[PDB]
Amino acid sequence: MDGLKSFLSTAPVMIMALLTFTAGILIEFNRFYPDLLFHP
Amino acid sequence: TPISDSAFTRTFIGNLPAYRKGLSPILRGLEVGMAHGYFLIGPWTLLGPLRDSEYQYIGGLIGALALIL
Amino acid sequence: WLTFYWHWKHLGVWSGNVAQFNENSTYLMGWFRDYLWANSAQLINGYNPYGVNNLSVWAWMFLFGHLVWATGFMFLISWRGYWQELIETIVWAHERTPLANLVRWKDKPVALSIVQARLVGLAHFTVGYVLTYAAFLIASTAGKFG
Amino acid sequence: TISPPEREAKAKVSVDNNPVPTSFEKWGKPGHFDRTLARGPKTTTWIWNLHANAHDFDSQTSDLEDVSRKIFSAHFGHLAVVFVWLSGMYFHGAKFSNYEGWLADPTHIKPSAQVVWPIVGQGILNGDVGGGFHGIQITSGLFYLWRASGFTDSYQLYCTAIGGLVMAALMLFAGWFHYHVKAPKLEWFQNVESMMNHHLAGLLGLGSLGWAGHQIHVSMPINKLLDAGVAPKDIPLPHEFILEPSKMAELYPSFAQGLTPFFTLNWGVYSDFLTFKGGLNPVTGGLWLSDTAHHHLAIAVLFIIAGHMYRTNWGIGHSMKEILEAHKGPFTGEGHKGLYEILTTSWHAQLAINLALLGSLTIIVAQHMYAMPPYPYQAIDYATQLSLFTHHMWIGGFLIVGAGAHGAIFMVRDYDPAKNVNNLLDRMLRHRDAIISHLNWVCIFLGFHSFGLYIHNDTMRALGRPQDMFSDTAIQLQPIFAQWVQHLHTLAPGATAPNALATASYAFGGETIAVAGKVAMMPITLGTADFMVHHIHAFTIHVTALILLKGVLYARSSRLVPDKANLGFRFPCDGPGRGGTCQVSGWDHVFLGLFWMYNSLSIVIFHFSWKMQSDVWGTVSPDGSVTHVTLGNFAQSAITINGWLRDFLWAQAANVINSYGSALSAYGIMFLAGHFVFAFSLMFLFSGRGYWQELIESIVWAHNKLNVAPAIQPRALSIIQGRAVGVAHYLLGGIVTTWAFFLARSLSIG
Amino acid sequence: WSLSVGIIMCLCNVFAFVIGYFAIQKTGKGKDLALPQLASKKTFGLPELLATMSFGHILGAGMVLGLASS
Amino acid sequence: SHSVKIYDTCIGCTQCVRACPLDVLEMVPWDGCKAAQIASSPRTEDCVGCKRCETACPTDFLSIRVYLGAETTRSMGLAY
Numbered sequence A: 001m002d003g004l005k006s007f008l009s010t011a012p013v014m015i016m017a018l019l020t021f022t023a024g025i026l027i028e029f030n031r032f033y034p035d036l037l038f039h040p
Numbered sequence B: 001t002p003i004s005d006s007a008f009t010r011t012f013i014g015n016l017p018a019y020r021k022g023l024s025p026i027l028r029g030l031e032v033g034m035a036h037g038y039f040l041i042g043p044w045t046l047l048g049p050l051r052d053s054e055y056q057y058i059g060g061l062i063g064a065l066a067l068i069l
Numbered sequence C: 001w002l003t004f005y006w007h008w009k010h011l012g013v014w015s016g017n018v019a020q021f022n023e024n025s026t027y028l029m030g031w032f033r034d035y036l037w038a039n040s041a042q043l044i045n046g047y048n049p050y051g052v053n054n055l056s057v058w059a060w061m062f063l064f065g066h067l068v069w070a071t072g073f074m075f076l077i078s079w080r081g082y083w084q085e086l087i088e089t090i091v092w093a094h095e096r097t098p099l100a101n102l103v104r105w106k107d108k109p110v111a112l113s114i115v116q117a118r119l120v121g122l123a124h125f126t127v128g129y130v131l132t133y134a135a136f137l138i139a140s141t142a143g144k145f146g
Numbered sequence D: 001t002i003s004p005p006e007r008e009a010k011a012k013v014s015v016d017n018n019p020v021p022t023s024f025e026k027w028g029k030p031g032h033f034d035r036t037l038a039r040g041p042k043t044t045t046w047i048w049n050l051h052a053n054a055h056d057f058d059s060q061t062s063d064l065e066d067v068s069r070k071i072f073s074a075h076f077g078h079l080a081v082v083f084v085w086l087s088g089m090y091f092h093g094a095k096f097s098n099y100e101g102w103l104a105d106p107t108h109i110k111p112s113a114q115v116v117w118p119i120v121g122q123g124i125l126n127g128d129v130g131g132g133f134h135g136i137q138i139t140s141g142l143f144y145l146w147r148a149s150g151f152t153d154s155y156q157l158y159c160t161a162i163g164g165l166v167m168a169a170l171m172l173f174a175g176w177f178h179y180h181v182k183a184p185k186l187e188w189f190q191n192v193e194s195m196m197n198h199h200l201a202g203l204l205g206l207g208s209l210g211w212a213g214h215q216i217h218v219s220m221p222i223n224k225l226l227d228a229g230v231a232p233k234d235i236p237l238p239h240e241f242i243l244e245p246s247k248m249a250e251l252y253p254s255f256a257q258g259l260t261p262f263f264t265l266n267w268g269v270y271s272d273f274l275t276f277k278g279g280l281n282p283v284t285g286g287l288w289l290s291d292t293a294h295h296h297l298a299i300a301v302l303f304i305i306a307g308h309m310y311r312t313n314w315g316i317g318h319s320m321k322e323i324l325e326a327h328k329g330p331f332t333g334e335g336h337k338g339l340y341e342i343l344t345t346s347w348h349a350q351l352a353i354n355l356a357l358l359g360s361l362t363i364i365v366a367q368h369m370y371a372m373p374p375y376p377y378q379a380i381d382y383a384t385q386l387s388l389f390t391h392h393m394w395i396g397g398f399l400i401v402g403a404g405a406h407g408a409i410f411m412v413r414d415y416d417p418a419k420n421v422n423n424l425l426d427r428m429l430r431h432r433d434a435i436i437s438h439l440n441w442v443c444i445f446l447g448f449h450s451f452g453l454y455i456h457n458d459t460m461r462a463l464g465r466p467q468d469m470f471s472d473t474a475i476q477l478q479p480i481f482a483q484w485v486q487h488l489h490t491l492a493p494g495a496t497a498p499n500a501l502a503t504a505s506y507a508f509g510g511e512t513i514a515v516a517g518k519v520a521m522m523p524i525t526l527g528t529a530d531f532m533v534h535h536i537h538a539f540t541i542h543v544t545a546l547i548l549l550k551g552v553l554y555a556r557s558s559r560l561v562p563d564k565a566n567l568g569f570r571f572p573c574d575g576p577g578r579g580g581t582c583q584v585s586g587w588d589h590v591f592l593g594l595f596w597m598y599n600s601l602s603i604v605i606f607h608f609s610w611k612m613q614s615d616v617w618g619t620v621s622p623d624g625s626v627t628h629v630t631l632g633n634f635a636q637s638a639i640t641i642n643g644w645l646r647d648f649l650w651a652q653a654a655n656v657i658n659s660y661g662s663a664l665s666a667y668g669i670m671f672l673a674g675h676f677v678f679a680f681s682l683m684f685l686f687s688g689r690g691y692w693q694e695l696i697e698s699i700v701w702a703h704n705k706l707n708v709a710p711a712i713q714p715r716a717l718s719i720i721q722g723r724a725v726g727v728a729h730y731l732l733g734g735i736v737t738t739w740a741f742f743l744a745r746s747l748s749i750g
Numbered sequence E: 001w002s003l004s005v006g007i008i009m010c011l012c013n014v015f016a017f018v019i020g021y022f023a024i025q026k027t028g029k030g031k032d033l034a035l036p037q038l039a040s041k042k043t044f045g046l047p048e049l050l051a052t053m054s055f056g057h058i059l060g061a062g063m064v065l066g067l068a069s070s
Numbered sequence F: 001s002h003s004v005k006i007y008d009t010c011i012g013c014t015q016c017v018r019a020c021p022l023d024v025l026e027m028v029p030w031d032g033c034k035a036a037q038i039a040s041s042p043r044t045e046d047c048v049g050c051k052r053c054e055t056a057c058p059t060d061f062l063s064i065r066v067y068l069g070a071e072t073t074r075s076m077g078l079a080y
């Protein structure tokens, strides 16, 4: 139903989903290529 | 309440100058003074700055004569 | 901040140890430790259970400034109405105490206004901010070099 | 929803069939529970007010029968949350710890139940705790509990976590069931006599009964082998003891007789495992489990008997209404009349009692666990001891102020003056000024005659005048009463306790028990430095009580505000008039009492942490001498503020600032982080929103300049919310600082 | 066990029986029958009867274990 | 004593008088609004300045203004 599709798309749920996704991006990038004080 | 007004308190509240019956403004603070420097001497009897010298009974006297002032 | 900067870098220059400042001032723990905690040793040792040296007056003024600075927090955090109620309770207490209601007051006691509250709190904060840092700056300097 | 049969058998059961249907359309509608918020957000404050009133069910609906059905399912959901959290600990002990590696050599290794993912340098946080394991050394004392419970394999903790998750699912399901399928009426609730009978006889009685049975069949026969020197892999399983009752009959002489003597009043024969030794265990440093099983059996019998005092359906029993209406003397007029009706209708009236008692009991838990260590090897783990003590201090400290909050809530929302005519509450409301002014005087007295002593000692030691101090080497302030009761508890096993073999705790006086190379518990000599700090504690608690009491005795009205009851519980003020009416509500009084609870516990935990390190804890020599950490300077240095500034703070904070580059670096990070949050709170606590709204005006103009202003108009936090964020960040920063400091200091003492 | 029942346990049961037949407010208000005429076990409802039967076990334990150990 | 003024932007809704807790404000018949009334402040001697009127004003910015002044026993809200 749409009542739960609207709850999954609320401000806090989405603003935490984006933060989790960006955390995953940054964590994996600094896992495979860590220690980038600058660009070579 | 009993503490505020009882048998002994009804008279004793009314027994010191500003409640005492017909006491002159000369004696306006007899007790209010006879009870001051007599108990101010207590803390200076065994605890004062000069409690372990030879004037154990002098610092209290002078301090009381100043605190009463 | 400015005075921490000046004092730490000048300690480094005076002791010939500019390396300490140039290599610790980049992270805050360097300030919290190599400056605040490190240079306080003599300061807090002005009066000890073992003796009393010339820094004792500064060791007393440090805690004094802390006390005044913390006293300002009362006026700045709690506001008037609480104190007006607490004062009214005391007014009732005096006007009902035998051998004391006969001690009447011309000035009706009231709590400090909000403007006066902020002013007194800021004044205590400023006194405890200046005196404490001065007792640190003079004591920690008159030890390693004074 | 679903449709079960009935589930009743001539009971007071009363439910409503499907009152609230199950749907998701209300999930996409935030703030629907409030009429003022359902029309849509027009300012950003609408968002904050959404969370500030999420659980306040009085402002939502006025029907109490709906509020109670909400509260029941809320408790079920909380229990589901708790079971999830506990299954977390059991699973992390099963697969992310070294409980097996610690149980083997408990004196040569440290407990650890967390593994940090090696990434961006944080893999350094995995400290070598011993035995090849790398992780964070825990301080919650879970390995000691799991050893005292009989856990020996990882599969046991795994199944415990599985059962915890199952119970979480069950509580979560029961919550939905008791609000969407068959929600109970009011007839099922207001049986406080019946509820007390059931909560005493069944919950607290049968609980300790079953746990004592567990200990007799699991904990005792396995900890007896653990304390002997037997390897855990050679120790049998708990069910092998019931499958072979002869192995239990032999391991305890009393067990070699059968079950009949218990039924035939032959209790004295079971003295071979239901013991009364007391003291501690010289092998583990904790309490004897043979005594704890007996203790739980006694508590079980006592509670089951207590659950048979009140009246239910068979005529016998008491009615608390009768007991309250009976108690009345010439001093209080009608006495407790109307109190049953107070506590059977107002939920806040009940919570203001339950929170107070639960917080006090948490504090008692801390004070009893620290001195009579009930878990093996916890008295040697100084970190775990300190952590449990301080954590159960803080939990109780918060739960106590909760009582002073909900009391004022009851006063403003549920106090009916017609229902309280010349009873305890009504007559207490009369002489409010008397009690408040007397407590004012008492607080002033305790402030002068406890802290002024420290100021005088600092000024005397600063002036170079040792013979004028309040110390153990000058004007002594010896605590006679506490030392006397210490000596009383010391002479207990040979006078007022012939059956007791050892004292309740070795802190009062007696022998010095030590495990491995560290001490477990020794007599805590009380002198001047203890008397002064005890009076400091009393003063701080008195001021906190004064604040939280004037918060309730004046939530209705006052000489300043006579119509305060109209303003509600939570409100900032009543205008700058009357000289200034800022912070008069009960909400503001709780906001102020939070700070004083923090300030009191800040001295309590420091008293604990320094007295233990100075006059108790310390390494023991093989000849017999005991050398304390701070060399016993508490009795000679804790008497001045400079002593606490230098020899306590400055001296013992070195472990935290020098923690960079090690496994304790996170503690220094959090130390500075709490120092940050503390100061961040001062911005809110010292300012007012009238400036921030004027600034938001300029930022709104800037946003509209590029046409980027949200339709949700931005509004600065309300005055109440400003104060709330201030106090929240103050407490958070302070407690994070003290937590980091205490953990980094306790882990660095060996 | 040879005489622990009649001398104390039955004695304490009957003691609680008397003090409950005389002191309990609501006796016959219980759910049980108490139909047959007995000395003191079914003269009033078995709620009251079982109440004193439990309290008499309490008293009997407190007296037997209070005599001399076990 | 405090000063209480009422401006011509007042719509005469009596809300500030319904919120006043010291009978400081009244309502006199006017000729400016539909209600044909405007707020009045005859008994400024009883005005403590709790701003309960200004809080209960509907017009764009206040139509009634309170300006705190020389505080007295009555304006200070002294009950002792």
Ligand code: CLA
Pocket (backbone or CB within 6 Å): D020, D021, D022, D023, D024, D025, D026, D027, D033, D069, D070, D071, D073, D074, D076, D077, D078, D080, D081, D084, D172, D173, D174, D175, D176, D179
């Ligand atoms: C999928 C099952 C389900 C569904 C569809 C609903 C649907 C509804 N419930 Mg409901 N409820 C459920 C399960 C469910 N509930 C359970 C299991 C419980 C027991 C805790 C409750 C207890 C409950 C109460 C007391 C009330 C409702 C109410 C409502 C209605 C409004 C809910 C709302 O405000 O928005 C949605 C709300 C949220 C999404 C809250 C988010 C979750 C919070 C922040 C924390 C989650 C805690 C959780 C219960 C336990 C944690 C799980 C564990 C793994 C940690 C709505 C139609 C209210 C009502 O009837 O309106 C008057 C009402 O008062 N429910």
Ligand code: CLA
Pocket (backbone or CB within 6 Å): D051, D052, D053, D054, D055, D056, D057, D355, D398, D399, D400, D401, D402, D403, D405, D409, D569, D570, D587, D590, D591, D728, D732
């Ligand atoms: C089981 C105990 C209990 C229960 C059931 C309640 C229940 C209630 N309380 Mg209450 N309270 C309690 C204990 C309890 N309280 C205690 C111990 C205190 C002392 C601190 C208070 C102080 C208190 C106040 C001052 C108020 C209430 C209010 C309320 C009512 C509304 C709750 C609310 O505002 O929504 C939801 C609650 C929130 C949105 C708070 C969120 C902010 C939290 C505190 C942040 C904490 C951060 C986190 C824990 C740690 C930091 C990590 C971070 C980095 C993420 C509600 C019925 C309010 C009321 O109006 O009463 C009717 C009210 O103003 N309570």
Ligand code: CLA
Pocket (backbone or CB within 6 Å): D676, D677, D678, D679, D680, D681, D682, D683, D684, D686, D687
């Ligand atoms: C350590 C205490 C502290 C801190 C951090 C601040 C910080 C700030 N003050 Mg401030 N102030 C303080 C104490 C403090 N103040 C005190 C005691 C007073 C006297 C009452 C004032 C009075 C004051 C005034 C009058 C003003 C400020 C202003 C500002 C802001 C200026 C903008 C800036 O610095 O850029 C950047 C911001 C920061 C560096 C701070 C943000 C730090 C966080 C950690 C960033 C990350 C966000 C975080 C992850 C959020 C997630 C939380 C999650 C865990 C729940 C800033 C946020 C001015 C302002 O509003 O700006 C326009 C302003 O006019 N302050």
Ligand SMILES: CCCCCCCCCCCCCCCC(=O)OC[C@H](COP(=O)(O)OC[C@@H](O)CO)OC(=O)CCCCCCCCCCCCCCC
Pocket (backbone or CB within 6 Å): D327, D328, D329, D330, D331, D332, D333, D334, D335, D336
């Ligand atoms: C640390 C203690 C060692 C120092 C000694 C201090 C002596 C304390 C004074 C004696 C107790 C006074 C209370 C009983 C006196 C008592 O409760 O009598 C009973 C009386 C009412 O009883 P009724 O006759 O109405 O009984 C009917 C009731 O069931 C209710 O209707 O209560 C009051 O007196 C009200 C006045 C309270 C105000 C006095 C209390 C003083 C506050 C400080 C108390 C200190 C206690 C410290 C304990 C840790």
Ligand SMILES: CC1=C(C/C=C(\C)CCC[C@H](C)CCC[C@H](C)CCCC(C)C)C(=O)c2ccccc2C1=O
Pocket (backbone or CB within 6 Å): C074, C075, C076, C078, C079, C080, C081, C083, C084, C110, C111, C112, C113, C114, C117
């Ligand atoms: C304690 C307190 C009071 C009560 C304070 C009172 C009643 C003042 C009492 C202080 C007396 C007068 C002694 C002060 C001693 C000073 C050092 C004397 C300085 C005066 C100069 C002339 C020297 C408030 O009124 C108040 C108002 C708003 C916010 C916070 C607070 C607040 O915290």
Ligand SMILES: CC1=C(C/C=C(\C)CCC[C@H](C)CCC[C@H](C)CCCC(C)C)C(=O)c2ccccc2C1=O
Pocket (backbone or CB within 6 Å): A015, D683, D684, D685, D687, D688, D689, D692, D715, D716, D717, D718, D719, D721, D722, D723
């Ligand atoms: C700064 C300040 C404000 C303004 C404060 C504001 C506008 C709060 C800012 C909140 C921002 C918009 C959200 C950021 C904080 C979030 C709650 C953190 C959530 C982060 C997750 C999404 C990860 C007041 O309103 C105020 C009121 C009364 C006294 C003092 C003050 C005061 O000092």
Ligand SMILES: [Ca+2]
Pocket (backbone or CB within 6 Å): B048, B049, B050, B051, B052, B053, D467, D468
């Ligand atoms: Ca001397």
Ligand SMILES: [Cl-]
Pocket (backbone or CB within 6 Å): C047, C048, C049, D461, D637, D640, D641, D642, D643, D644
């Ligand atoms: Cl010192």
